[PDB]
Amino acid sequence: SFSGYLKLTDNVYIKNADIVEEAKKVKPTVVVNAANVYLKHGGGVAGALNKATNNAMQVESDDYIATNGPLKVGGSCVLSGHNLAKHCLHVVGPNVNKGEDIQLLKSAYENFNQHEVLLAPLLSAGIFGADPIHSLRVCVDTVRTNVYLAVFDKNLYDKLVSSF
Ligand SMILES: O=C(O)C[C@H](NC(=O)c1cnc2[nH]ccc2c1)c1ccc(Br)cc1
Numbered sequence: 001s002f003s004g005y006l007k008l009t010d011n012v013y014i015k016n017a018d019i020v021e022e023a024k025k026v027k028p029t030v031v032v033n034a035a036n037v038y039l040k041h042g043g044g045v046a047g048a049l050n051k052a053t054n055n056a057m058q059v060e061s062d063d064y065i066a067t068n069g070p071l072k073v074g075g076s077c078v079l080s081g082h083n084l085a086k087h088c089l090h091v092v093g094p095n096v097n098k099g100e101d102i103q104l105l106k107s108a109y110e111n112f113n114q115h116e117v118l119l120a121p122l123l124s125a126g127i128f129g130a131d132p133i134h135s136l137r138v139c140v141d142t143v144r145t146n147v148y149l150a151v152f153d154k155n156l157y158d159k160l161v162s163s164f
Pocket of ligand 1: 020048121151
């Protein structure tokens with residue numbers, strides 16, 4: 001049910017789209033959230049996904065952290081997708097603005113390999129401070145499952161396609 005995606009490789013597809021609107025339309029099995037270790041969904045992709053669930057994602061995440069403690073940078077957990085998807089794979093890419101190791105980006109993308117098909121953003125991009133061109137390269141060289149990337153910014157989308 002994904003449509004209008006540009007094929008980059010055998011298993012990586014990309015589209016200039018708002019990931020919230022794309023999730024509401026497609027209702028995929030898995031939507032990836034650009035999470036932090038605390039599952040505090042304040043801004044960026046995480047804030048936008050949580051707002052679309054009417055804060056139900058935050059309530060569920062706070063119960064998860066109270067039981068399990070924080071995730072690792074490069075780690076993930078599977079929670080409900082609420083009204084946006086069957087499941088949400090919360091994945092923690094390194095946040096370069098908070099001083100985290102960029103080599104953990106490959107570990108973060110490895111979490112996608114546990115799911116046959118996913119709707120996802122580029123990890124560690126945007127407010128996480130990493131170079132999105134680097135993030136797309138690690139994605140294509142690490143994920144073997146079918147990933148549909150939603151890039152919110154039109155100008156960044158055009159730069160990613162032109163330089164791929
Ligand atoms: O989409 C991405 O590639 C990641 C990131 N997106 C958001 O922060 C983001 C924020 N608010 C949102 N409301 C609905 C979707 C949505 C996404 C981003 C990165 C670089 C630039 Br320039 C712009 C946006």
